[PDB]
């Protein structure tokens, strides 16, 4: 919430955000 | 030709109705309400003598407060209110001259030309520092009718205005260009705002100031940091309702 830019993020998703991973 | 004005409506003629002539219309759309009001006009001024890292406290100095009420209509401290409220009339700042400036804040262009009873729009605000000394300021935007929260600092040497989740802006430094601009959505609980008069009261015991509608504004702007700042309003996606008279102009 609170992101409203139409062009994709300049930094890749792996870098812009922490990587969510399931341990199971 | 003949007609009957008592009907409450007569035709819009061109020269061809009564004479040997032709329509002479050319396309033009700069008269659209949206286009007309979609430009920035000076609408307020703000002044602060407190530093950024201090507790914000409402003040007035020669008719300039360190906070404003976001509305094109005249606003000012009314009957010793803590913060400025919407006024019902404009007064000269000077008690003698009988010439402007006025002590009241407003978008003169809107007051002088608002041929409608209600309006709806988003507000683009521009705040500019009146001199070239490097800016160092914090501004807090409070939505229409929300708590002003004029509280103490919760931490030492911090701008109390920034101590909020409300939208706020912080500009400072040698790399800045001494101004701030942003756009806020319409936030009033009212569907449309009264552009001139509101023929009623705002509370249930009818003790408020007759003529002023409840929560008829776009919120408030509180500022801290040194300087005098001018404010502009730009009406985005403007929509108006019910045509009404414009301000009278003295006969030439």
């Amino acid at each position: 919430g609170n992101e409203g830019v139409i062009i994709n993020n300049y930094y890749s998703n792996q870098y812009q955000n922490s990587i969510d991973l399931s341990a199971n | 030709g003949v007609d009957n004005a008592e009907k409450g409506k007569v035709s819009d003629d061109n020269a061809s109705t009564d004479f040997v002539a032709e329509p002479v219309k050319l396309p033009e759309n700069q008269t659209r309400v949206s286009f007309f009001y979609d430009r920035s006009t000076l609408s307020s001024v703000l002044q602060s003598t407190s530093d950024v890292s201090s507790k914000f406290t409402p003040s007035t100095a020669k008719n300039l407060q360190n906070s404003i009420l976001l509305t094109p209509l005249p606003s000012d401290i009314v009957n010793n209110s803590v913060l400025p409220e919407q006024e019902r009339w404009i007064s000269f700042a000077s008690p003698t001259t009988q010439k402007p400036p006025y002590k009241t804040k407003q978008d003169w262009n809107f007051i002088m030309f608002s041929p409608f009873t209600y309006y709806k729009c988003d507000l683009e605000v521009t705040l500019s520092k009146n001199d070239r000394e490097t800016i160092s300021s914090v501004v807090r935007y409070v939505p229409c009718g929300a708590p002003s929260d004029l509280s103490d600092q919760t931490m030492p040497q911090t701008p109390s205005l920034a101590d909020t989740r409300d939208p706020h802006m912080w500009v400072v430094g040698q790399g800045t260009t001494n101004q701030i601009s942003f756009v806020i959505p319409y936030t009033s609980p009212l569907s449309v705002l009264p552009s001139v008069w509101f023929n009623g009261f705002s509370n249930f015991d009818n003790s408020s100031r007759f003529g002023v509608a409840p929560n008829a504004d776009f919120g408030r702007l509180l500022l801290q940091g040194q300087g005098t700042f001018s404010v502009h309003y730009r009406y985005k996606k403007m929509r108006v309702f019910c045509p009404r008279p414009t301000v009278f102009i003295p006969w030439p």
Partner: protein, 232 residues
Amino acid sequence: SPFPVTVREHAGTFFSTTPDTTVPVYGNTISTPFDYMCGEFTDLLSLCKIPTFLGNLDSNKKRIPYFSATNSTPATPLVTYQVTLSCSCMANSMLAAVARNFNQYRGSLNYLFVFTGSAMTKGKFLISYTPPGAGEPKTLDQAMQATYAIWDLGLNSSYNFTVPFISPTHYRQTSYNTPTITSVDGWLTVWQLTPLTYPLGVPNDSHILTLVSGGDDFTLRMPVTFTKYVPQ
């Protein structure tokens, strides 16, 4: 990799009329519903087309929305309006109020006259529009030499007169410092062709309401601010 940029010479400038938007600081907000509303209008031209009152001078120099006529035919016009959206006689009409906020206009002007005398009163007026170049018309003979319409009183009460757009330029100025051939466009004068005529028991003076508005093909352009004044 970072993009190389050339900072233009106008960095930091605040353009009050740039056709672009700025940063939204409180987005994803619903604008309080107003679908129940009525009376919305989208073009300021709509206002210009609504006939509103002209201010005529009283015998005591007081402003009134009408002029007088009686049982005689003066050798001079009953009223004279210079065609300029700047004319002082129309200074408070919606047409002028809107035009004051635009630089130029083009198209027809509608001058509406409403006879308010008794039903027993008859008479004829000659409404004339004289283009410039040879000065204001001094006699009926001259006024008839230009664009005119004869208004005969009767069952229908009003007369909708159109001042045709006759101009050397496609657009004309709405105001001016000194009159020029692009800001002043002639005169509209109304003459008494036949005297107002009536039976006994009828007041000698009849009042004719006077209104103005833009015509069908009337337009305005170039949003501007008019010379400020102190209300009073």
